[PDB]
RNA sequence: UUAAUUGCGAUAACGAACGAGACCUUAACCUACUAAAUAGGGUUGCUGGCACUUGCCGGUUGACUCUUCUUAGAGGGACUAU
């Protein structure tokens, strides 16, 4: 007997976007075909991670500078959900790049 | 561990760089071409695209085995957490890195530079890519520095599609007189480019309209009524 | 429920969110009477739409504007835009098309950004200088 | 005179009948006349405003700079010296004070006074760098009306600042007295003095 | 012979995009809904006070792209708007708030047809489909049968055909150069009317409903019998057309030609008037062309909409 | 400073040559036509193509032109 | 003619390639969509003060509801359009 509502909460992470977006699409499609109550795939400010460096390794030349960056997207979600179907959902449909974390909200 | 998400992502990136430089250092003689890191909740698999798959595999699959332990020894991963997979490259012609390593190896044997480079570019054209370039700089048979370019087809230099299609590799070759820089640029065919745009930005494809005969002017028609 | 609509106005960062209801001529920005905007000289500007149309235009209306961001002049201009946009939105939605028409005519007939947002927005600073289009200095010798 | 009840009580002078837009609720643009027939259409007294500060796009196009209210151009040109480049609030307060002073000195509703001062101090002839290297000369050239307006504003504000520098007298009042001198032909004004000097140099080098 | 000449009375303005469609509520005389490229449906009250014939009432914001066709409800309280923002919108004409947003097309929508009385919704769209919606928002039927964009679907009026039929017939057209009329309950295909040498842009049935007219680029107007299932006549406008509207009482046909408006007396098969109003500063090639037409219930007033963002009223007064 | 370089003009000219009966004086309609009937990567290029096609439609309506 | 070897064209030149553009990031516009206690808002509880007329200004992981504002995806929007 594992009927207790779990309030399970997922949080995604991805350097890129489309993999994260399709992962979220898969998670929501699985939850809805499983008849679950969800708080939608909320959108969080994609944290830009910036580093500005000098191009020249020696400092000679006109001052020229460049800005590398990533843009990380988190977009957590959360379900009012039982265990076994949901934990199985968590352990399925992961592609590389996207990192998934689960907290039970115990 | 309890580590900020941004810090963890940077750590994953620098770990990716770890493995990439590792494989370039060691597996070069076996024809290393690229690395990928895929993670399941269970294990973190490392997928190693190489030219000569068996030599990377080694005798009776021993070689792969040792590499795994090195990783688990170097990066403190527990036994069985990470496994290694060897696959043949889809096609060695397209992967510029394999071509550049082939260049370096063929020079190591002391081959004709122009002959070797033209063999490489001909192989690239044979592989179906729509443009190749190989650049060699250094002490070409002399003391004064030189830099000759050997190109065919055509290559685009500017515009974000440069990253979208054109693969590029650079290698240093150790000859008795010093170091020779080789740069390989391969412009992948947009038609067969997965995971990205299927054509160049300015490639306009007009579609042929199907034709019909217009003589049927009056042509009263009737269907049977349907519920 | 009470006919009520919500609008916004901006100035480069400053955002004024205005909620307008069918009330009794209640005009508060940040929960304070509109007479008390600190610029004190830009003060007439916060009145500025009203005097164009005449406050009698909103005697059965109440406006509350919460405003954040920006500096001060930006804040005041955002408040102005919020007020004008709220008047226009309410009158268009519940009163009549022609009413909104003379309101738009009066607003646009004076300091066009009073109704329309200003798109004039700062751009990033390139390297090599103190400003986006400034260079440090050169020696030559 | 017809006050309207609301939940918030707008003060007397602001709420009474003010569909008669005034500069600072004090001075009216009506009755303001442009003497010289040229500089009309180059001063925007036709447009009534309630503050002398309206941040609009008045410099992107070739000639929209003329649509600026004249008082705002004066304000924006008060702030010189580099250090005080911004702080428009300071400039608008100074100009408001100066309008009050002009209201004191010769009641004549001040906007007419400042417009007349602008008209008078414009140099109708200028000089130009023409002499080539060796036999340098000073050529006499006619001037643009818009340039006359802009030049008048610049010389007025320059005179005001130079009068106020390290001086007990304040910028507002120094500007006011310069405007008073410039409404007439009072050569005590620095602005008209420089205008005369420029006119004379142009004339002597016809 | 038939000395009845209509004259313009005034103009209706307020749209900032082309007057794409008009629609008159049967029950209410002075009500007129007009859609524009400005994405804003304007409801007009007709006033007999002065030169302005009609006066706006409510503007219906809620459309992000072009509004193409407009249809009013039977009572005069709802109106359906077809838009290029990939949706349909149903509006209450008193409050002014849309309550239904019909979603599901892939090519942007072009045409709307109201039910006979109230129950169903008929929409045409570039996605080569015709959608039969309910009043709340769900799509019940997805009619297929056109390879190209369907330009317009209009419900065939049911005058007296049988007392009761339990069936609602309508018509559809597009660039397939074939006109497919349909029946609705259940609600399946029926006959094709292949007549057009160049593609059709507008079809609008006669007020009785047994007759319909189609026209397009070629300038040929094919007028057709619905129940009799026979081609009636083939006029030619000698010019590209935009809209055709049947007059209610007269046996007439207004047509929105590229140059002006051609009125045909169908019984005599002869045109009786051209509409070419005056504009200033238009060098004979930038003449705004009519793209919306509407005949009021009496049939004595015509409402037209050009690209000049103008809606004109043509009062049909007798010239003795 | 807009002059609409070779690619837009050539693609447009082809579109006229192939579909003149299917083009109109309008931009929006011609925009959707060119989007549907040809594959254009970036929508800015598609808008430019539609604009040139509309200009050519207006030119033809005024009078036949070379090329 | 354009900012452009950018085009109109004229043409012992013809067709092609790079560069420019095209392209990507960002900035702006989306009362259209998708949603949101890690962002907000309305109503409504329970409370604090004042005016006492039911009005304001407040507080409050209470309840309900909403997404204009804040987010970020899909997209829409301009191409010199008229
Ligand atoms: Mg290029
Ligand atoms: Mg600076
Ligand atoms: Mg570029
Ligand atoms: Mg929003």
Curated annotation (Swiss-Prot), chain C:
Q: Which domain of life is it from?
A: Eukaryota
Q: Extract one GO cellular component term from the record.
A: cytosolic small ribosomal subunit
Instruction: Give the molecular function GO annotations.
Output: RNA binding; structural constituent of ribosome
Asked if the keyword Ribosomal protein belongs to this entry, the reply reads yes
Note the PROSITE patterns from the entry. RIBOSOMAL_S9
Segments carrying the region annotation (Disordered) are: 121-141
Biased composition regions of type Basic residues, renumbered to the chain: 132-141
Return the protein name: Small ribosomal subunit protein uS9
Look up and give the organism this protein is from: Kluyveromyces lactis (strain ATCC 8585 / CBS 2359 / DSM 70799 / NBRC 1267 / NRRL Y-1140 / WM37)
Gene name in the database record: RPS16
